[PDB]
């Protein structure tokens, strides 16, 4: 479960004598339960990005508290929040974040190495997950030698390698074609329908948002339209 309520954030930009504070989040009340695809719909820089940053753990929110899996994360320092991200989080960032260089197999295995999984178990998990996603027939294929759709697919495979409760994503199809958009979206839908996994996908497209179990439209920094309309 994800519990976000009365959360606000402000950004200070400029020199010490030119500290300009522009609040973005205004008492966000995002509430997601286990095993549904939540979604945040808003314009570019409207406030979805900062909300995803706070929910992931990159920025500590200024006020309010955030609870994931029944545990308070606002007071987490960098070490504890990173430990939480290791074992209970996954990431599908838009830029595909695929380590320019290296290989697909090692890109997928990277979070296993970070957590500390033993080698043969790592091999088994990577092979099984790459088989599940569908990019198993590439092995040591460098990310630069893949297309953007395959980059998104291998990023998803990396996210699923530690079977986390939440695999909250940025816009997974921000730079993607419509066909690859539909493919990635149905892949994520099948993820939820196979294994109960919370999603906090943030996008500026409502068609991408349509697959979710909940709608959360953020207009100019304040959330609204929080419903659970069945698709």
């Amino acid at each position: 479960m994800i519990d976000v309520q009365h959360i606000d954030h402000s950004f200070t930009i400029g020199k010490k004598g030119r500290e300009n504070e522009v609040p973005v989040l205004k008492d966000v009340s995002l509430s997601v339960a286990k095993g549904e695809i939540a979604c945040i719909v808003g314009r570019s820089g409207s406030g979805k990005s900062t909300l995803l940053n706070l929910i992931s753990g990159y920025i500590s929110p200024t006020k309010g508290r955030i609870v994931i899996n029944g545990t308070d994360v606002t007071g987490f320092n960098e070490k504890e929040w990173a430990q939480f991200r290791l074992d209970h989080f996954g990431f599908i960032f838009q830029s595909f974040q695929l380590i320019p260089g290296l290989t697909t197999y090692e890109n997928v295995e990277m979070p296993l190495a970070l957590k500390g999984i033993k080698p043969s178990e790592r091999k088994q998990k990577v092979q099984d997950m790459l088989k599940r996603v569908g990019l198993e027939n590439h092995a040591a294929h460098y990310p630069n030698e893949l297309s953007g759709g395959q980059q998104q697919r291998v990023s998803i495979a990396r996210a699923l390698i530690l079977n986390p409760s939440i695999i909250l994503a940025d816009e997974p199809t921000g730079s993607l074609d419509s066909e690859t958009e539909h493919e990635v979206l149905e892949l994520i839908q099948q993820l939820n329908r196979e294994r109960g996994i919370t999603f906090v996908i943030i996008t500026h497209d409502d068609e991408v948002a349509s697959i979710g179990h909940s709608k959360f439209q953020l207009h100019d920094g304040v959330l609204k339209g929080g419903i659970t309309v069945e698709v």
Binding site: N53, S56, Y58, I59, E78, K79, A82, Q83, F84, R85, L86, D87, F89, F91, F93, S95, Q97, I99, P100, G101, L102, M110, P111, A113, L114, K115, G116, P119, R158
Partner: protein, 436 residues
């Protein structure tokens, strides 16, 4: 993240820039070789000075010449300490001496008063003869033939020396005595200097049996023509040839069984403090000066090692800048600050440690080259064949290798500390948004 995965990541990232990490490793290797070779110059100076000290004189001497307060220095109060092997007592005699055997007279001779029992418990190097425990038995010096020149030969040698003035030219003479130095029961000019001051009374000359001869002295250049008069005859010698006092220089030895026993005897000072000139007392000041010299050379090498440390820091900030994407998404995954700091501190420590190992091997090679070339250079330059002596101008003990490893690993880790903090404080948001 365990250790194998961290090593794999470090190797993968270092493989990206081979010509840069190899150059950093070369700079560190040259600095470690520099530090070890330069400090080993001082270490070898200390080792060769210690070896020269051991070779120049007897390893176990413990001379107590120069008693303060004019208090008695009699042997009767000198035997009771920890495992003192010998309390040999010496009183040199300044008398006109010349071997009264034919036309050959041994003008140069240094009579030494000793009991042969104290000699046996002192283990002085003896070439011939078991013991001379008798009133009329002596042991002659090793150079008893070279200094035993005939009157005409000595006169012509002195005239030839005067012809060449004070210049030490090739002026040489045959080695005097050529017959056997076996048991002959010969007498050597016990003629009095008025017992010891100034007048020369009745000559008088005891007949002494030559039981044996002494071995080669502690050094080749210095000669030896001792007589080794028995200490049982010392009572009558004092009674008739009263020399006690100044034509008298006490050379009492406190020789112990071994060098560690010399060290413990030196520790047992402040009661037998008779101005001891033992090898340990003399070498304490040398050890202090060598500690200062080795510390100075260690610091001088440390300057050149800090230069390579600055180079390591440069290449490590270079690596942090190049690895910003990988570190950023690793932090996004949850790599934790501790793991990334350990990874980058380990990359810096690996650069430093590989540089130190390669530089220590190179330093062993350079020290071998120096130890082989320095005797050759000494032989070639100042026309002396290096004196046919053994020197160690460059010695690298295991201690010096330990200091080198510690210093170079420490400076490498210190250099990597700031890139490690930079790589932990990546601000993942920036690295996850690319650039424009």
């Amino acid at each position: 993240m365990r250790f194998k995965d961290q090593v794999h990541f470090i190797r993968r990232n270092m493989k990206k820039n081979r010509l840069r990490v190899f150059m950093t490793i070369l700079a560190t290797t040259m600095a470690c070789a520099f530090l070890v070779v330069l400090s080993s110059v001082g270490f070898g100076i200390q080792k060769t000075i210690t070896d020269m000290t051991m070779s120049q004189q007897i390893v176990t001497k413990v001379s107590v010449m120069g008693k303060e307060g004019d208090k008695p220095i009699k042997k009767a109060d000198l035997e009771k300490y920890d495992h003192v092997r010998s309390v040999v007592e010496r009183t040199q005699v300044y008398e006109p001496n010349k071997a009264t055997l034919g036309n050959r007279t041994n003008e140069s001779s240094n009579l030494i008063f000793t009991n042969m029992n104290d000699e046996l418990k002192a283990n002085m190097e003896l070439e011939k003869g078991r013991v001379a425990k008798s009133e009329n038995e002596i042991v002659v010096g090793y150079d008893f033939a070279k200094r035993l020149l005939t009157k005409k030969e000595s006169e012509e040698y002195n005239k030839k020396i005067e012809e060449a003035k004070g210049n030490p030219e090739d002026i040489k003479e045959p080695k005097g005595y050529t017959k056997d130095i076996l048991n002959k029961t010969i007498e050597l000019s016990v003629s009095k200097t008025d017992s010891k001051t100034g007048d020369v009374t009745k000559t008088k000359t005891y007949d002494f049996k030559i039981v044996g001869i002494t071995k080669k002295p502690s050094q080749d250049w210095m000669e030896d023509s001792n007589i080794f008069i028995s200490d049982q005859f010392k009572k009558d010698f004092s009674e008739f040839l009263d020399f006690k006092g100044g034509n008298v220089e006490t050379n009492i030895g406190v020789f112990a069984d071994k060098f560690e026993n010399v060290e413990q005897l030196t520790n047992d000072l402040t009661d037998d403090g008779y101005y001891v000139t033992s090898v340990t007392t003399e070498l304490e000041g040398a050890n202090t000066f060598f500690m200062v010299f080795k510390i100075g050379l260690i610091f001088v090498g440390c300057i050149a090692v800090i230069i390579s440390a600055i180079g390591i820091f440069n290449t490590m900030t270079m690596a942090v800048t190049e690895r910003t994407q990988e570190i950023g998404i690793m932090k996004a995954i949850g790599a934790s600050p501790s793991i990334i700091r350990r990874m980058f501190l380990m990359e810096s420590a690996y650069i430093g440690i590989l540089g130190c190992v390669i530089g220590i091997i190179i330093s062993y090679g350079v020290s071998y080259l120096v130890n082989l070339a320095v005797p050759m250079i000494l032989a070639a330059t100042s026309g002396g064949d290096a004196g046919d002596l053994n020197y160690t101008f460059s010695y690298i003990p295991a201690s010096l290798v330990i200091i080198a490893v510690v210093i170079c690993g420490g400076v490498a880790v210190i250099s990597g500390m700031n890139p490690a903090r930079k790589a932990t404080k990546t601000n993942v948001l920036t690295a996850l948004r690319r650039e424009l």
